[PDB]
């Protein structure tokens, strides 16, 4: 009887950085149809479909006949988890960001390509908006990446502080998507905290999203455990010593907890937790930024401002090829040519001027 | 020894969107009897029975002899879950609603057909009642579907507010059945909340049914955690960032939480949770609507007002073929001809007039 | 069909003291590429890669074709756990430290070698800083190792007491890395404590890191259960009787709980818990040590002061070959020659003088 | 393919009373090396190594090639648990103590033998110290063994009451090691108590170590649930009726809970819990006993006073061969000859005199 | 390869009413030794050993070579549980007591036989003591058995009320051993109660041992939840309706909860819980009964008063052969002849007279 290559399914999971057994089962099954009569092949909607369709077609047909599909996908997903463990100990944090970048560029190459649906001019309007959020933004993003890559103890966490609709969440999300990693909710009590901090295992960075303090009901701020919990998580935030992180059906992982961001409202920060942050960026709602967005509907509809591709487009536009690792230089040059065709320094400056007047960014 | 095609059982589960292992085992076993001497074949009661009976008959006989029935059905149900994961990432939300629509029309074609038991005139009396519940109802339902399909962050949740027996529950249920998805109970404390929000995994939409607030015992309103919890679930309701949803024996899923509805009584909405809703629809008990229903017993007995087929019948009656995706145009035309035979604009208007006088809708 | 040697995978896990199934899967898979065309082979970055690449290459290719990779690695990791159990009962605590030392020297030989990236002069600047932290430091570290190796009941725990940024954490971490073992958090309540103390199973030593007391909010010290819990854990700290330690999916282990350190701020120690510690070392922030470090950035960036290799480099520099077990004498002599080439007693004394003036240690 | 004898691995586990799967895996693997070139064979350090090395050598080599090591050891450990169940119902409590004695004598024969490291004169100095702790000590130990062996309901528990460093813990530990069994912590609340009392399953005796009462903070005594819990555990302490004891992944065992000791500080004992103890021994710190020990460092360093071998050495020295079961008479005579060579009634009396003056026991 | 008869191991478990997998493994393994050279065969200590040794000897040797012993014993123990389920629904409660009786008589035949160790005259002294505890005792025990066998709703529970050392526990234990069944602890809160009441599954009777009430600290009575809980367990105690009982890894069993006894101190019984008991027996400490026992040491030492064999010996002595089911008449006659040889109505009456004077029962 015909036998499926577990090695080939693993290769596909490795190529797509697949961490989901059900999505792998689903993705691998869609390869069983003939590429000459396939709808998703000729339409070129997924890169993980037409490029791999030929390589996995025969194996996918065999797979469609397996009595043991879930096990095949479990070992593939486990090999992907096994790759990340080796990487976290033998890969330099620079090579870790190049990987993330190459991943974001594949998704970029797809959607802006002659078989994609996204509009590049709209993403560049996102870059305009983002570049208006803070002064020296392209340098603020570059200083963040240096900080996260270098991972220097006690100089690893940035604090984003401000009211709702100030840009703190959007930028933290954008950077989280830029570097790769997870967002964490430390508002739960110390008891259930342990399984939450375990989500941090093998992550390149974390965002402690919307951390809450107490005695701020008078400022219309809700109470939560987040601020006090963060004072107790000194070892995690400082990253001088390794910590024992827990998650279900697994021996508790030991590692230096990841660096990243903490976001919160205008709560008073305890003296001890304040010294844990190397930098603090204060965000305030600017009327021109909100009206601009209200006029540039596509930015919300397409989730452009929360996109890591948007911050990558920003770096490609503002920074020369030398500011990127040698491993993606040819990919940077290609994106630089493409962006040049769509926008210029004069038109970009006009987009920023349109943000400043709170008018639709694109005329 | 004779071997069962796991691939054929999976095909049947895929055809029927089967998420239940026990119902799949049961359904597949009933196919083992001869279609020439079968009772359920000639009676034509289930579409998932006579249309598939021929295709699965021999395999069902083999299946009846298997020592491993539950495993066969586990992989079939897993492949269905795997399809939804791929769909949630590679299918447009428009194609997701066309699927739901095609599903509802199969159930419609069955029950109103020459082997069904439901009375079409009674469903059209349901449409009358529903079309009386709010002005421009056919447009209110159409604006909801646009909102849910487009899934624009911060403009994704509608609030249905009113006392008991006002129509808010009925309509939320009707729309929930129209789009497909799950209802959620956030009245439990933050601790047990996490497994509840996980029910939202791969769902096209959610309904936070009967959300309770505090300090309303004086208005004869019971206390619950629902309102405060919803303020803390800002990330979920806004859908700008992806969230980590949990459920049993599964790695915590990351996705933009689904859009939908929140239903509640006349509790004061905190300023912060009020801005999370794009639209708020106020429902008030109308005496003519309750008496009408008291006179039109069939509507409760057959659960017509909570039916998504009822809202689909409404759209088919009020909207031209062009307001529907091209993929169901032939199916719309057929239903339009069928409805024409049973009702007219003059008789429909009379049904609405009968609702307005609180008389039985059908004379 | 080709069969993988489970015995060879176990041998590799045993060689590398591997306790992680996912890292073992990952490490063993990277051996499948040709050593003549391999990138990690010629670069000589991991010792667990090029030295074992030849021995495990063919088996790794077979392993890449296995339908049962996780099970193979489970038995390998279990055999490593089984080795530690036999060792904890049949190995002298002196042989246990020689093993830890040989492990640290392999990592040392790697990073300072002609294919490593670490700078030896920078580690020796770490030794300078550490040797300034307390008087007779080389003797304080040697008295700690005697204490931990001899494991005399009631004379097994040292207390490191002082404010934040005093050196207590750094040194406890450094010694914990020197001896091998785990850090424990006893700040959680007595209920969840049991699974925490189980982390101590087969450990050569433990560090109860940052133990908190009550009624110290007035000294800007946060409350925690740690101090009271430690009074109740008399049996564990005294080590006269064996204790029943618990962890998931395992029969509760019975053994004399490990010795080690307790770190805490300037909380009042209850009379009963004070007598449990043979020695108490008071740490105070010295301005010259902090400025020195602020000037010697490499120490934080490379985590030199928390390194057990740093304390081993210290012992190799200060102590003659006779102060080490006979089993590592040839390894001590080699490191002594290497250190001599880079630094002298005159230049070391200058480094200490630079610490004392709070200037960058290396000129 | 070569097949491992599961029966031979079980025989080894049975011989060594092995209750640990990981230690069995480890122990059985060390037998695979050639006994003619083995280091642990010629050194004669473990009796479970050289005596069994020949018998298990070939099977251990086969075992080293097994793909199913953990299962083999699970059945071996289960057979050992199965032996204890049969023994607890078909073995007389006298035969149960002879087994414990034979076990202690094997460990004794090993360490004092021409390939052991322990010094017999030092253990006899331990006997001196212990024989000074209470008058008629050799008779106090003998009355305890009668009490535990006979297991007469309501006359089964002895209470050891006194301050810290009084000898109560040491003696309870010594007797617990003499009889075999487990120590229990009943200071946890009634909720978590059930899994703690389950540790008592098949145990020959138990020690409720350091039981705490309330309203004693004024005497510098910490509060705990232990005293009240013990009043509620009337059925367990009385042993007239069988009790349902619980532990993980097992059907709740029914048996007469084991007899033993309760240790506690100078807390007031409730009238009802006082009648549950047949005997109460009051321990007070004697300055001469503490100074003696401070002068006889070897006693702590080697854990001689907590050793059951120490109490066995005591009985062998004080009691004639007739006071022991006929099954160990030849073993008693041999130890009597050996002890005679090292010590005399005159020199023993001098050791006791040295304890009484608080001087080092050995001159 | 030689195959073990799972059917034969099941037959042995069925014969011995074995509910323990570990004891079955142990018992079945001891049959592998030659019966001609076996020690336990010729000594005739266990009936489950020499009578079955011949029948299971060859299978036990095969079993000693099995790689799957625990599974074999799991199916045997499951078949025993399966027998009890069929019995509980198809066996009359009279046949259920005959089974219990035949079981007790096998243990009786063994211990009093020419290869047993128990003294019959001592058990008859137990009968004397028990027959003194309450007037018309032989009739009080017979009325209890009628009550439990007939199992008439609302007339199923007897209340044993009195202080400690009054006889209530002893008699409840004696009757519990007479009928077969389990003792339950309802002093835990309603939350953990559900798994406790599940112990009642397939049980012929239950004893709610030492039920505690509140507001009795003034009478030197400890507080517990037991009394209030019992008011809430109306359905269980009344046995008119079936109840859903829960236990681990099993679908919640539905049945009429078993009848039995409730024991408690002199707490006030709430009016509602008082009507749930058909009979209430008041026990008071009698000085003559305690002194008698103090003089008849063998009764405690051998646990004669808590023995169901003791109550069976009582019925055999007091009641004619006709008061027993026809199925055990030959067994009753044999015991009647045996008892006649050891004791007479005149000597029994003297034993009762010795109890009444508080003197040792046997002269
Ligand atoms: C109907 C409705 O809810 N409308 C709505 C539309 C846009 C809104 O803004 C945002 C939404 C998402 C992400 C970022 C922002 C902003 N960032 C900044 C940054 C700085 N100064 C202002 C803003 S707003 C808020 C609400
Ligand atoms: C005996 C009994 O319980 N009778 C009963 C019968 C009908 C009732 O109404 C409803 C029941 C289900 C769904 C919707 C409604 C209503 N929707 C509106 C909408 C607007 N103004 C009024 C209503 S009623 C209530 C109670
Ligand atoms: C921006 C920022 O956070 N800077 C920073 C830089 C260095 C700091 O110090 C330390 C950091 C890690 C480990 C040890 C120390 C010290 N040990 C002693 C020991 C004795 N007297 C002083 C010290 S400091 C603190 C903070
Ligand atoms: C530095 C340090 O902690 N020293 C130390 C050294 C010895 C100590 O004693 C003991 C230690 C273990 C076991 C027993 C004892 C005693 N038993 C009795 C029995 C009767 N009267 C006195 C004692 S002491 C206490 C402390
Ligand atoms: C040293 C010690 O603890 N001695 C001891 C010895 C015997 C004791 O009694 C009993 C023990 C077990 C079972 C029953 C009884 C009694 N039943 C009745 C029944 C009626 N009036 C009196 C009694 S006593 C109590 C304590
Ligand atoms: Zn394709
Ligand atoms: Zn049919
Ligand atoms: Zn290599
Ligand atoms: Zn050997
Ligand atoms: Zn026998």
mmCIF file of N, CA, C and O and ligand atoms in Angstrom, chain C residues 30 33-35 38 40-42 49-50 53, ligand 8:
data_model
loop_
_atom_site.group_PDB
_atom_site.id
_atom_site.type_symbol
_atom_site.label_atom_id
_atom_site.label_comp_id
_atom_site.label_asym_id
_atom_site.label_seq_id
_atom_site.Cartn_x
_atom_site.Cartn_y
_atom_site.Cartn_z
ATOM 1 N N UNK C 30 19.469 18.311 12.678
ATOM 2 C CA UNK C 30 20.496 19.135 12.019
ATOM 3 C C UNK C 30 21.751 18.362 11.593
ATOM 4 O O UNK C 30 22.559 18.890 10.832
ATOM 5 N N UNK C 33 22.403 16.699 7.312
ATOM 6 C CA UNK C 33 23.110 17.315 6.185
ATOM 7 C C UNK C 33 24.554 16.816 6.132
ATOM 8 O O UNK C 33 25.109 16.468 7.176
ATOM 9 N N UNK C 34 25.141 16.748 4.908
ATOM 10 C CA UNK C 34 26.512 16.276 4.642
ATOM 11 C C UNK C 34 27.541 17.123 5.389
ATOM 12 O O UNK C 34 27.481 18.344 5.276
ATOM 13 N N UNK C 35 28.466 16.515 6.175
ATOM 14 C CA UNK C 35 29.447 17.328 6.916
ATOM 15 C C UNK C 35 30.471 18.016 6.020
ATOM 16 O O UNK C 35 31.073 19.000 6.450
ATOM 17 N N UNK C 38 28.216 21.030 4.848
ATOM 18 C CA UNK C 38 27.512 21.665 5.968
ATOM 19 C C UNK C 38 28.141 23.004 6.341
ATOM 20 O O UNK C 38 29.368 23.143 6.325
ATOM 21 N N UNK C 40 27.355 24.740 9.495
ATOM 22 C CA UNK C 40 27.626 24.682 10.939
ATOM 23 C C UNK C 40 28.819 23.779 11.312
ATOM 24 O O UNK C 40 29.338 23.883 12.428
ATOM 25 N N UNK C 41 29.247 22.902 10.376
ATOM 26 C CA UNK C 41 30.373 21.980 10.554
ATOM 27 C C UNK C 41 31.701 22.733 10.444
ATOM 28 O O UNK C 41 32.511 22.668 11.373
ATOM 29 N N UNK C 42 31.908 23.455 9.312
ATOM 30 C CA UNK C 42 33.109 24.237 8.991
ATOM 31 C C UNK C 42 33.271 25.501 9.842
ATOM 32 O O UNK C 42 34.404 25.906 10.108
ATOM 33 N N UNK C 49 27.655 19.761 17.755
ATOM 34 C CA UNK C 49 27.377 19.673 16.322
ATOM 35 C C UNK C 49 28.491 18.978 15.520
ATOM 36 O O UNK C 49 28.215 17.915 14.986
ATOM 37 N N UNK C 50 29.716 19.564 15.409
ATOM 38 C CA UNK C 50 30.807 19.000 14.588
ATOM 39 C C UNK C 50 31.466 17.723 15.152
ATOM 40 O O UNK C 50 31.905 16.881 14.363
ATOM 41 N N UNK C 53 28.641 15.177 14.672
ATOM 42 C CA UNK C 53 28.121 15.141 13.297
ATOM 43 C C UNK C 53 28.496 13.877 12.562
ATOM 44 O O UNK C 53 27.626 13.262 11.954
HETATM 45 ZN ZN1 LIG F 8 28.030 19.742 10.641
#
